[PDB]
């Protein structure tokens, strides 16, 4: 469950950024919003819909 | 409608943008591209005494934050063209360096490593006056890039030894990259 | 701990996102991931996707 | 020769392109020769037939024959005995209208009857449901055969008493096989 | 964009409509006349975009054809006709 939450939290960090929020986590993660594997997702989704 | 190339109105309109951005926050991203054509037209040419119009607009751009994401590739070139060009009056030039420093805290610069780094390196050589300022831009840019900076280390080092330049912040981070452990 | 927002900040009020934004990301990622895809300027180059 | 996807496209264009062009044999020969750099005639059938036809309407019936006997794959000038092969059916049909135009007229007719006896067998027996486009074009052929049979039969015997039941049995069978086609109705009328 | 189309065709063939609209809409505007090179390099791209697409870009050919042939006559939208004729050739080829 924790693993599922943190996986998904990475998505939150990426989205909520674009609306002037920043999420926070107690084990403090590094910033992952710019990480290039997101632009893979973007393409993957694009094709797949 | 009421943007023109005249110090008179431009000052006030820019102060308006400043208050809109902080009002809408994330929402401003939509209305940004209607305004970019005017912004780029300000830097490109400006008759303002000491280029202070463009300083205020730099000071506006400082506040865009994550809004500026999709339009950084438009807006980063003319910013760079201030801090490289010999003619430009020192105050404006400083603001442009300090602007890139602000934007580093809330955008990604990995695409524009080469666009930013080479002019910083150039500025370090030509003008000795901005050597502190430009180092504090570069230091933060390195901080944001991380080990993506490893290419540039030597190239930059060759101006850092030439003029004997010392920043805690820079030296720390380079040594920290080569050994591999950032905070 | 996991927290939607920083101590300064206020959550978005934006009509097309849900008010549950941090929960929805945390526990229905694909549903908002797709909806958020649709709200970007990225969709300019995927015509016929509403 | 480079692009292996643009090929079907290019042949279609090569076809369309050609039909604007003027209908004189040397011009077509040149233009065809050019395409012969990378397309065998066992591929662009519907130009080579149309090429043969052009020779026929300009009186180079030997030249035309040469083209068709190339397409058929085996010779029916040499064997005046055996049946004309049907495996390239539109081609065979083209051989006979050439054949008639060069005055083996009684023998052209004679073969054409075998053609439709064999071709309608290739419908009613060999129609398994999947080949129903094949039989569609084959019907628009059969009606082109049947209609020729009538038209010819008059130029052979004449219009009197005995011939008329036959020719009407033909045209009416044409108009049955190709419902929509103008000339079948205009004939029958 | 010219280069990106020609060089990486697999990427572009899905995003043909968007690119092509954005390109056509440059040619339709009245105030990109102060630079000739926008119109030239837009046409050059349509040439390469045509090359890649092939039949996929059939329905758009009539639209472009009017635009291009209107440019060929009356060189006020003064593209080097070299480029316009080249593109025209490319459309009809593809």
UniProtKB/Swiss-Prot annotation, chain A:
It is found in: Lysosome membrane; Cytoplasm; Cytoplasmic granule. It comes from the Eukaryota. Highly expressed in skeletal muscle, and in a lesser extent in brain, lung, small intestine, kidney and placenta. O-GlcNAcylated by OGT upon glucose sufficiency, promoting interaction with small GTPases Rag (RagA/RRAGA, RagB/RRAGB, RagC/RRAGC and/or RagD/RRAGD) and subsequent recruitment of mTORC1 to lysosomal membranes, leading to activation of the mTORC1 complex. Acetylation is decreased in response to fasting. Part of the mechanistic target of rapamycin complex 1 (mTORC1) which contains MTOR, MLST8 and RPTOR. mTORC1 associates with AKT1S1/PRAS40, which inhibits its activity. mTORC1 associates with DEPTOR, which regulates its activity. mTORC1 binds to and is inhibited by FKBP12-rapamycin. Forms a complex with MTOR under both leucine-rich and -poor conditions. Interacts with (via TOS motifs) EIF4EBP1 and RPS6KB1; interaction is independent of its association with MTOR. (Microbial infection) Interacts with vaccinia virus protein F17; this interaction dysregulates mTOR. Component of the mechanistic target of rapamycin complex 1 (mTORC1), an evolutionarily conserved central nutrient sensor that stimulates anabolic reactions and macromolecule biosynthesis to promote cellular biomass generation and growth. In response to nutrients, growth factors or amino acids, mTORC1 is recruited to the lysosome membrane and promotes protein, lipid and nucleotide synthesis by phosphorylating several substrates, such as ribosomal protein S6 kinase (RPS6KB1 and RPS6KB2) and EIF4EBP1 (4E-BP1). Belongs to the WD repeat RAPTOR family. This is Regulatory-associated protein of mTOR. It comes from Homo sapiens. The gene is RPTOR. The chain holds residues 342 to 390 of 1335 of the full protein.
From Swiss-Prot, chain B:
It is found in: Lysosome membrane; Endoplasmic reticulum membrane; Golgi apparatus membrane; Cell membrane. Expressed in numerous tissues, with highest levels in testis. HEAT repeats lie at residues 1-29, 30-66, 67-105, 106-149, 150-183. The modification Phosphothreonine is found at residue 123. The kinase domain (PI3K/PI4K) is intrinsically active but has a highly restricted catalytic center. It is linked to Smith-Kingsmore syndrome: An autosomal dominant syndrome characterized by intellectual disability, macrocephaly, seizures, umbilical hernia, and facial dysmorphic features. This is Serine/threonine-protein kinase mTOR.
Curated annotation (Swiss-Prot), chain D:
Autophosphorylates when part of mTORC1 or mTORC2. Phosphorylation in the kinase domain modulates the interactions of MTOR with RPTOR and AKT1S1/PRAS40 and leads to increased intrinsic mTORC1 kinase activity. TPR repeats lie at residues 10-44, 45-88, 89-126, 127-181. Expressed in numerous tissues, with highest levels in testis. It is found in: Lysosome membrane; Endoplasmic reticulum membrane; Golgi apparatus membrane; Cell membrane. It comes from the Eukaryota. Transmembrane segments: none annotated. 1D-myo-inositol hexakisphosphate binds at residues 57, 97, 144. The kinase domain (PI3K/PI4K) is intrinsically active but has a highly restricted catalytic center. Serine/threonine protein kinase which is a central regulator of cellular metabolism, growth and survival in response to hormones, growth factors, nutrients, energy and stress signals. MTOR directly or indirectly regulates the phosphorylation of at least 800 proteins. Functions as part of 2 structurally and functionally distinct signaling complexes mTORC1 and mTORC2 (mTOR complex 1 and 2). Belongs to the PI3/PI4-kinase family. Part of the mechanistic target of rapamycin complex 1 (mTORC1) which contains MTOR, MLST8 and RPTOR. The mTORC1 complex is a 1 Md obligate dimer of two stoichiometric heterotetramers with overall dimensions of 290 A x 210 A x 135 A. It has a rhomboid shape and a central cavity, the dimeric interfaces are formed by interlocking interactions between the two MTOR and the two RPTOR subunits. It is linked to Smith-Kingsmore syndrome: An autosomal dominant syndrome characterized by intellectual disability, macrocephaly, seizures, umbilical hernia, and facial dysmorphic features. This is Serine/threonine-protein kinase mTOR. The lineage of its organism: Eukaryota, Metazoa, Chordata, Craniata, Vertebrata. The gene is MTOR.
